[PDB]
Amino acid sequence: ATRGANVIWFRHGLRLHDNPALLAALADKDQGIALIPVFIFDGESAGTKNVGYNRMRFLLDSLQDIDDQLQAATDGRGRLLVFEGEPAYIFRRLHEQVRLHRICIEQDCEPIWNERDESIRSLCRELNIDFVEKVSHTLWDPQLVIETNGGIPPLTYQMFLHTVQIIGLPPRPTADARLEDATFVELDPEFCRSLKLFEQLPTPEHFNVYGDNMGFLAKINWRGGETQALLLLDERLKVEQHAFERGFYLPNQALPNIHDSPKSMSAHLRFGCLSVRRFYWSVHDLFKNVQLRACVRGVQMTGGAHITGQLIWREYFYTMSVNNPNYDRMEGNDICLSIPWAKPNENLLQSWRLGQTGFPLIDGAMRQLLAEGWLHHTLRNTVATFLTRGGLWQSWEHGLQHFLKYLLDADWSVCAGNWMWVSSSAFERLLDSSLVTCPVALAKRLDPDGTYIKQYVPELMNVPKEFVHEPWRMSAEQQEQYECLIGVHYPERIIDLSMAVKRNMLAMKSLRNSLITPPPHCRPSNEEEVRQFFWLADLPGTGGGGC
Amino acid sequence: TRGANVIWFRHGLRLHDNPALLAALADKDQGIALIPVFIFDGESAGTKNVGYNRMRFLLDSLQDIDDQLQAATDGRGRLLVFEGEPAYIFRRLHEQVRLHRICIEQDCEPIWNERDESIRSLCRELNIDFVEKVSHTLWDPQLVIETNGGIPPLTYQMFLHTVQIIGLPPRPTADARLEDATFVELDPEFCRSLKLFEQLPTPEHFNVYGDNMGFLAKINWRGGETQALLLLDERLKVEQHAFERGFYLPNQALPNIHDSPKSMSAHLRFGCLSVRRFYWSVHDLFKNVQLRACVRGVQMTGGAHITGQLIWREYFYTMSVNNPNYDRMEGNDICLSIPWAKPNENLLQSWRLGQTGFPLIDGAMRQLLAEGWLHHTLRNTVATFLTRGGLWQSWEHGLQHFLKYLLDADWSVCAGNWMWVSSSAFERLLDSSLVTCPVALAKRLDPDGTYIKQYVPELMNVPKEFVHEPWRMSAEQQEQYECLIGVHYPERIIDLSMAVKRNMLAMKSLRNSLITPPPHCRPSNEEEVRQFFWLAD
Numbered sequence A: 001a002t003r004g005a006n007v008i009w010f011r012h013g014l015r016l017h018d019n020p021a022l023l024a025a026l027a028d029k030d031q032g033i034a035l036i037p038v039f040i041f042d043g044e045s046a047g048t049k050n051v052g053y054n055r056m057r058f059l060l061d062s063l064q065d066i067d068d069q070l071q072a073a074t075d076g077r078g079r080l081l082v083f084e085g086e087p088a089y090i091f092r093r094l095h096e097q098v099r100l101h102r103i104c105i106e107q108d109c110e111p112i113w114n115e116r117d118e119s120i121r122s123l124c125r126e127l128n129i130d131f132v133e134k135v136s137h138t139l140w141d142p143q144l145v146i147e148t149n150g151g152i153p154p155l156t157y158q159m160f161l162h163t164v165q166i167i168g169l170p171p172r173p174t175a176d177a178r179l180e181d182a183t184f185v186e187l188d189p190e191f192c193r194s195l196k197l198f199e200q201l202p203t204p205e206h207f208n209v210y211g212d213n214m215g216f217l218a219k220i221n222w223r224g225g226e227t228q229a230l231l232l233l234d235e236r237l238k239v240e241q242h243a244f245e246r247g248f249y250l251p252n253q254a255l256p257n258i259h260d261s262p263k264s265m266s267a268h269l270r271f272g273c274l275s276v277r278r279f280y281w282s283v284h285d286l287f288k289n290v291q292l293r294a295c296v297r298g299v300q301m302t303g304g305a306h307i308t309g310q311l312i313w314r315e316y317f318y319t320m321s322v323n324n325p326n327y328d329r330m331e332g333n334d335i336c337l338s339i340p341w342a343k344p345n346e347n348l349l350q351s352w353r354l355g356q357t358g359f360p361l362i363d364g365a366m367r368q369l370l371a372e373g374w375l376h377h378t379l380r381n382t383v384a385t386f387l388t389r390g391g392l393w394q395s396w397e398h399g400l401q402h403f404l405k406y407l408l409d410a411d412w413s414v415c416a417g418n419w420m421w422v423s424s425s426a427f428e429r430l431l432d433s434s435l436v437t438c439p440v441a442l443a444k445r446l447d448p449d450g451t452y453i454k455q456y457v458p459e460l461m462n463v464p465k466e467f468v469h470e471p472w473r474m475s476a477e478q479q480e481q482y483e484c485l486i487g488v489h490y491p492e493r494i495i496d497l498s499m500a501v502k503r504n505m506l507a508m509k510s511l512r513n514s515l516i517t518p519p520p521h522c523r524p525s526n527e528e529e530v531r532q533f534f535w536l537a538d539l540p541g542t543g544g545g546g547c
Numbered sequence B: 001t002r003g004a005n006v007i008w009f010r011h012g013l014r015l016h017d018n019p020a021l022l023a024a025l026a027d028k029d030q031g032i033a034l035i036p037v038f039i040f041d042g043e044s045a046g047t048k049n050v051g052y053n054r055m056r057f058l059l060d061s062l063q064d065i066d067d068q069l070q071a072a073t074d075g076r077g078r079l080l081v082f083e084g085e086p087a088y089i090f091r092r093l094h095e096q097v098r099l100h101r102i103c104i105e106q107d108c109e110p111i112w113n114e115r116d117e118s119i120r121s122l123c124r125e126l127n128i129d130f131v132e133k134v135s136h137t138l139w140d141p142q143l144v145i146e147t148n149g150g151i152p153p154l155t156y157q158m159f160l161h162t163v164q165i166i167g168l169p170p171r172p173t174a175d176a177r178l179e180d181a182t183f184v185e186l187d188p189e190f191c192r193s194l195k196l197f198e199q200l201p202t203p204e205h206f207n208v209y210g211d212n213m214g215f216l217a218k219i220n221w222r223g224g225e226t227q228a229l230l231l232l233d234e235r236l237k238v239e240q241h242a243f244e245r246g247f248y249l250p251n252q253a254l255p256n257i258h259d260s261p262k263s264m265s266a267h268l269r270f271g272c273l274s275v276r277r278f279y280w281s282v283h284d285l286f287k288n289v290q291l292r293a294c295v296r297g298v299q300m301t302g303g304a305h306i307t308g309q310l311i312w313r314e315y316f317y318t319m320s321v322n323n324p325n326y327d328r329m330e331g332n333d334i335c336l337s338i339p340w341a342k343p344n345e346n347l348l349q350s351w352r353l354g355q356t357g358f359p360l361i362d363g364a365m366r367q368l369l370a371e372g373w374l375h376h377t378l379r380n381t382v383a384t385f386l387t388r389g390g391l392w393q394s395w396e397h398g399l400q401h402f403l404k405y406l407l408d409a410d411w412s413v414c415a416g417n418w419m420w421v422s423s424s425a426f427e428r429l430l431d432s433s434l435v436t437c438p439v440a441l442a443k444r445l446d447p448d449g450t451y452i453k454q455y456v457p458e459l460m461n462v463p464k465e466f467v468h469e470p471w472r473m474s475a476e477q478q479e480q481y482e483c484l485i486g487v488h489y490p491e492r493i494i495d496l497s498m499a500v501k502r503n504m505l506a507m508k509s510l511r512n513s514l515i516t517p518p519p520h521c522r523p524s525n526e527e528e529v530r531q532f533f534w535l536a537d
Ligand SMILES: Cc1cc2nc3c(=O)[nH]c(=O)nc-3n(C[C@H](O)[C@H](O)[C@H](O)COP(=O)(O)OP(=O)(O)OC[C@H]3O[C@@H](n4cnc5c(N)ncnc54)[C@H](O)[C@@H]3O)c2cc1C
Pocket: A263, A264, A265, A266, A267, A269, A270, A310, A311, A312, A313, A314, A315, A317, A375, A376, A377, A380, A381, A384, A403, A407, A409, A410, A411, A412, A414, A415, A416, A418, A419, A422
């Protein structure tokens, strides 16, 4: 704090590697400019506006990871300062203590962050402070791929692939930061109490966040932070290594597995614990210059396109929301079809949230969502269709707000886009087939021996495998013979699906004859894209049928 | 006149991409004439073990060349078709008009060695240039074998790795200009003494008649170069629709056994269509464009899902080069010696005639006798049922029957595919019932019974729910539709559940006896088996 100080404000991108904003904050070590790493609980940033217990713990685990790494490389001189209040109020009064030359941040391209960031930009113009903004949460610059497509984001996944190949490959991750020679600031102890500088790392209880509806089914647990994200990346980079030397995927690898352990990095990518560019260019360097022939779920393995294509799905949804604050709703949302959803049935909606629908796979997935906060992509498709076009004809907004609260990742743009991609695509009639919107048939495909169902629906523990997916088929004597009387211990089906899929298919067909014009909306590229999205494989598409 | 060059046709019955032909016209400005020659010596172009369908195909291609030679020369150019010994014909042809060069296309298969070396020792005597050019395969098989250390690659993945080192295959040559080419009209008595055909002969001239049934063949094929080019341009438009769509329709990815005469395997066997023209046409149509979809476990970028099929053809041609025992078990170093049962002429005849009691097996073998072409999934079914997945008979019996009635019937490809499927004892998926059961495959390929009812017409009155398993019908059902297990349709000539049971024991006993799996023709991995048999992958 001799000649001033630079601020690296953390919101997302809670990491030290591949942090251009951190490097720009460390670029004045020679001039004696100090470094101040800060995180502010302003009541919305890092997804704290609508958060449950599982994601708040994940965020606090990442803040501690940054805090422990700073001390491990600065002999204890480096400290992550966690505040709680208005960001513009904290930065102005902190400028009274030490001179702020540059305030470095990572670009949050989502429009819900525009108010927060433009107030800091307006503050720096008043105090003559450099406002440094770096793009590192996404692979490309969202404004660069939007202007390439003519000032509007691509609405289909293929239209996004066509534009990024024009721009080229995304930038490589930056080098690591050296903090052994960096100086920090010891400010006034009373100034810390006024601006609410935490002396200890807070807990979710400090923010009135306690155990959720189910508490916790401690079968799957996730430790946040940059250390665990890099530990899981190397674990997966070796699984791809074995499949790379093998040249093909084992049949058990290409199939969706819902009985596995916490290996997903979607929560580490949302908070920015793991760099998306480091994920991308680690797969690229491991696959380039080796031609392959086998595929993984209809996507080639040559060049790692089956892995890096997943990171483009995330980039494709992040950019569609940039200049659209109504992206989470349908009124005022220009790229979402207006579907006549039924009236809010909060009795059925509560049966969907609590996992009391009478359908085993739906209940087992929603109870895992409440307890553990993570669902497989196949299970997220099932509960989304069952709530919307597939089962109850409820608006996807009621499912988005529930997901954004209990999900570990819960990207405001990725989660909202996936709800519209699946529920509000009227001209993709393959989504109306019960062969893709039936949880009973899918239960036999993902959970053959009822291992997953009985693990998160414990009332079905003793029913034999011949009646797990269809408990209603048991006799009156058999129902009390396995401690499961449908309607008492296990709830009955809140709706008849076979008569519900008929109502919804005709109600959606009614929209198509009224809208012969297909307006620009978030939709699948083609029918082949639906089959890979819903992990169909053997019998999907036109002419595939039931073999 | 002064001299003449001979373009001798054996394979490569075409005018385009014919480097041997271009070498014959290379001395056009010297006053050296041209002599197109095809000799029925009793073995060339697969005429030693041939049926009526393939002989009809060969003669259709010879007429195409003769018709093309007249349209480009206003009647001056003709195709000379002889019948006799090639070295005797060429020697007496040399004293009528001096032969400077004898140009042929390379036949790398060892069954043609004694024929070519016979002509080779003749030209060194009479001081004639023996020009041999490679155009039947994508690469020179010697350059592929020598790159692999002097031995041919025994797995398909080992082959793709070797040709990747060599590089992309050569592109087809330019078309030949025959508008200013001179020919010779020989002495009429010389044409009488050398057995020169005036009219193109018929299959009946070679003691070849209309098979056993013959009339069930209404899906007929017409040989020739210009007609093979029509099939190439036809599929090129189908592939660009998928190229512009970005993916294959599900009905396209599924095998189709009730389709049209679409295949070009017979045209590529006789050389009516150039394989390099086939390769580089698909390569130019898919280049510079990145695709992400796949076709049955193989990518579509660069046309690898199409060009990879042509590499299967080269992979079997290259393996048989220095192995004259490639079509037999004894003395074949690349074939596992499997204890096959003693030859049973009753079950073998029921396999050929299609009287085994299994509907899909009967419909395929009866289609082979009439039309002489089967889908790859149907050739697999009748091959496993004859060998490891049924009767446990030697693959040598099925090879001779296939080399006789097939339209393609490449000596190296057909034998290689027979060993690849039958004698792969260490590929344990090959013995799974998903591959060794035609009943489940019948409901998978021909669901409603359309293909079975037309090639097994004794089952057309049987409804769909009993057409795949006619033995399951009751007493009044075998009479209401009149299909008794005995007089109308034969009983299953073997117990399939018991046969596959005892055959898997013999393969394990073979593996337990062979602690070393010696280098043999085998699949590369289990994934390669799924793609080969059109499985779920
Ligand atoms: C209703 C619904 C809501 C979803 N909400 C989210 C969300 O809030 N956050 C989120 O990251 N993903 C979301 N997804 C996508 C998908 O469910 C997860 O990305 C996936 O389950 C993560 O598992 P994984 O990393 O092991 O899969 P991988 O195949 O390893 O995915 C690699 C990465 O690619 C990205 N990705 C994968 N699939 C998609 C997709 N369909 N759309 C966008 N990005 C994708 C993620 O960042 C993911 O971590 C949602 C999908 C649905 C159907």
